[PDB]
From a paper:
LPS biogenesis systems are essential in most Gram-negative bacteria, with [name] responsible for the delivery of LPS to the outer leaflet of the OM. The outer-membrane associated β-barrel is made up of 26 antiparallel β-strands (β1−β26). These β-strands are connected by turns on the periplasmic side and extended loops on the extracellular face that fold over the lumen of the barrel and require rearrangement to allow LPS molecules to reach the external surface. [name] is tightly bound in the [name] β-barrel.
Numbering used by the authors:
A (entry chain B): 999 to 1147
B (entry chain A): 225 to 758, 766 to 784
C (entry chain C): -1 to 12
The structure:
């Protein structure tokens, strides 16, 4: 058994202290990303900081689409597929900008009789997808670090 | 810049020969409009469509108003009806102002349930079972957000249109992190539920929940403890009719006050794959969770907005079994899951596989447990889930998921997909969707389990292809086939010649467009139209059918 | 006293 406990952090050492930027700093995705970063031991500086030479994580477009994945024999929708895609960038000061992305799939059955309930369900689903988007982008940070080297 | 667009035409089987005559109108830099006479021959009239797109300080929005003054087909199928006019109003508006004020509008109103089947699918779909009408005004800052919202629905189902509407709804959240070791959160809600019927329950609900959680993390381990305190007050009125028919009696005042204890733990083991591949790293992540919620009798409350949630691998660790705040089941359970990830030389995750299960110690009761499970298993290992995702190459990849239930004694839901994609113009994809009839019986309403169009379940195979020719043409096709019925569900073809000054497109689609209640078969709709406009348009054509293509990598 | 939005105004005065 070669399985050993992880000795490195999920977020690389260079990106321990970083800036977070977006046009929606008060949106659900920003909240999810900030929570994921604060859990991984990352210190977030304001964008106004005179402190230079810290990397910058700029969150970009977020698009959520609800499509019909399957239909019944009458053509009515059976499964609704929620797809969330998020684009972001990481600027390493003085070296380059590295683009990153996240995509989350989920599905749920439709129920017109309990339509209101289903709406609530959808809301909950969306609130989860943001979290999935926040852990994905972080898991892509080491790929940026290796790319910079 | 304001002038006639190039005309458009189609030949259907529901409106026969159709003709669009668009007219653009640049009213301002931020506002534009288009007036489209749409002559329909079978209905023998003109639907006047009007679109208005605007960009403002509040955000961006689109309004559509379609009006058909009179209809012959609708008149024939409803001889005794007062009028035969048809109309649709759509209003979408999303926007954030000064980074704090969030405005969302999604309104759709139609004159009759049959509108979407009988007309174009720009903002509607024949697959839709209902239309939604939501308004939302919110204020969000870093540690606070509030929102006043209105929800209304127009169900197209003739059997039971009756739906509940949350006309006022308030969602107040507050977050206070770094309160010593602990992190704190509070959620509040006030909602008034009204039904379209004059004899259904009506209720106002006030909900408050404090939350305190302690996160502790290392380089390999993460343990999080969490305590919630849910408090709900229901004031229900207009309950005579319900109590005159059902043995369970609804109360006018209900107070439900319960704690929730949750513990999450996860590890991260790592190894370096050597024989299989050089410099490839495999990660093994075990994850465990214990949840405890005591039981309260909810028989005095009508199920306004609680529905059973699907349990994927991520949903296995979700603490709620129902949505909303009406049915909160008891919980004494431990959930275990394992994830394996493969990382290549560039530290890019190329593969991951997940599998987990839920083991109950006590039955999840809610007071109104009427779910028709196929067996009587109440405790033990009851729910299983699994996911997989493989990126074989730059142009090739596949996905998969499965959920199994012992209470259904069957695989509740499954999905699979495999895609080849060089670029937006050249790609191939194959997908599969499954849903057992037992799952349909258990979760969907009672009449689903007896109706032929629903009781069989889902077993659907889809193929999508897009191949360019001579970097000017783009042949696009899609085929969806139900293997239980052995019948086509949706199929489309399309050809687009895209030059530098024009792009001609011809399309064809055959789709399921309703059920016939007499001969007990489905109605198919065919449409063949041409579109001239003044990329090869592959993605636009891929999204034109009722089962639109989605990128799977 | 009056909670006009967040109260039972469809059937309440019955
Ligand atoms: C746990 C590891 C995670 C990896 C997850 C990836 C799983 C990918 C799922 C691909 C399988 C989908 O296809 C799988 O095969 C058949 C084909 O109908 C279904 O089978 C079901 O329907 C068919 C008939 O329609 C019956 O013969 C069968 O008894 C019934 O169970 C399975 O229930 C479904 O799950
Ligand atoms: C504005 C107001 O005072 N409301 C309360 C008084 N009443 C009745 O007492 C019947 C009218 C009904 N309502 C509610 O029940 C909430 C709204 C207005």
């Amino acid at each position: 058994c070669g399985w050993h406990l992880r000795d490195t952090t999920q977020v690389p050492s260079t990106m321990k202290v970083m800036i977070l930027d977006s046009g929606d700093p008060n949106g659900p995705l920003s909240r999810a990303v900030r929570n994921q970063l604060r859990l991984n031991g990352v210190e977030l500086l304001d964008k106004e900081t005179t402190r230079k030479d810290v990397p910058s994580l700029r969150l970009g477009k977020v698009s959520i689409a609800k499509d019909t994945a399957s239909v019944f024999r009458n053509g009515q929708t059976a499964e609704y597929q929620m797809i969330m895609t998020v684009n972001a960038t990481v600027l390493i000061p003085g070296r380059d900008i590295y683009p990153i992305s996240a995509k989350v799939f989920r599905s749920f059955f439709d129920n017109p009789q309990m339509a209101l309930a289903k709406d609530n369900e959808q809301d909950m689903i969306v609130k989860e997808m943001y979290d999935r988007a926040a852990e994905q982008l972080i898991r892509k940070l080491p790929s940026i670090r290796a790319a910079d080297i | 810049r304001s002038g006639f667009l190039i005309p458009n035409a189609k030949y259907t089987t529901t409106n026969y020969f159709e003709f669009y005559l668009p007219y653009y109108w640049n009213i301002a830099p931020n506002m534009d409009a288009t007036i489209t006479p749409h002559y329909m021959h079978r209905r023998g009239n003109i639907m006047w469509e009007n679109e208005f797109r605007y960009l403002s300080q509040a955000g961006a929005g689109l309004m559509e108003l379609d009006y058909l003054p009179s209809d012959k087909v609708y008149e024939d199928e409803h001889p005794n009806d007062d009028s035969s006019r048809r109309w649709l109003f759509y209003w979408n508006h999303s926007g954030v102002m000064d980074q704090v004020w969030r405005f969302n509008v999604d309104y759709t109103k139609v004159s009759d349930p049959s509108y979407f089947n009988d007309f174009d699918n720009k903002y509607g779909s024949s697959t839709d079972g209902y239309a939604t009408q939501k308004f939302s005004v919110g204020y969000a800052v870093q540690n606070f957000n509030a929102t006043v919202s209105t929800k209304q629905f127009q169900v197209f189902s003739e059997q039971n249109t009756s739906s509940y509407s949350a006309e006022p709804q308030l969602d107040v959240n507050y977050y206070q992190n770094d309160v010593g070791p602990f992190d704190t959160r509070i959620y509040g809600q006030a909602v008034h539920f009204v039904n379209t019927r004059d004899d259904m329950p009506e209720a106002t609900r006030v909900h408050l929940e404090p939350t305190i959680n302690l996160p502790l993390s290392n380089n390999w381990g993460s343990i999080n403890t969490e305590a919630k305190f849910l408090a709900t007050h229901y004031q229900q009125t207009n309950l005579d009719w319900y109590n005159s028919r059902n043995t369970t009696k609804l109360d006018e005042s209900v107070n439900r006050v319960m704690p929730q204890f949750k513990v999450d733990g996860k590890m991260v083991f790592e190894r370096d794959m050597e024989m299989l591949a050089p410099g490839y790293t495999q990660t093994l992540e075990p994850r465990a969770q214990y949840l405890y919620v005591p039981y309260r009798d909810q028989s005095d409350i009508y199920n306004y907005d609680s529905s059973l949630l699907q349990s994927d691998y991520s949903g296995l660790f979700r603490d709620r079994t129902y949505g909303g705040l009406d049915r909160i089941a008891s919980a004494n359970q431990v959930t275990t899951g394992v994830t394996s990830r493969i990382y290549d030389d560039a530290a890019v995750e190329r593969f991951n596989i997940s599998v987990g299960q839920i083991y109950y110690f006590t039955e999840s009761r809610t007071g109104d447990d009427n779910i028709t499970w196929e067996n009587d298993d109440k405790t033990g290992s009851l729910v299983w889930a699994g996911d997989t995702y493989w990126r074989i190459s730059e142009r090739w990849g596949l996905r998969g998921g499965i959920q199994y239930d012992t209470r259904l004694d069957n695989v509740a839901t499954s999905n699979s997909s495999i895609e080849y994609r060089r670029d937006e113009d050249r790609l191939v994809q194959l997908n599969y969707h499954y849903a057992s009839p037992e799952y349909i019986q258990a979760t969907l309403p009672k009449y689903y389990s007896t109706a032929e169009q629903y009781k069989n379940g889902i077993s659907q195979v889809g193929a999508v292809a897009s191949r360019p020719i001579a970097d000017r043409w783009s042949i696009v096709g899609a085929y969806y086939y139900d293997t239980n019925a052995n019948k086509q569900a949706d199929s489309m073809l399309g050809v687009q010649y895209s030059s530098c000054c024009y792009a001609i497109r011809v399309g064809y689609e055959r789709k399921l467009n309703g059920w016939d209640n007499d001969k007990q078969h489905a109605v198919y709709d065919n449409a063949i139209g041409f579109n001239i406009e003044l990329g090869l348009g592959t993605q636009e054509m891929l999204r034109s059918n009722i089962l639109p293509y989605q990128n799977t990598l | 006293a009056c909670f006009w939005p967040f109260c039972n105004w469809k059937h309440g005065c019955a």
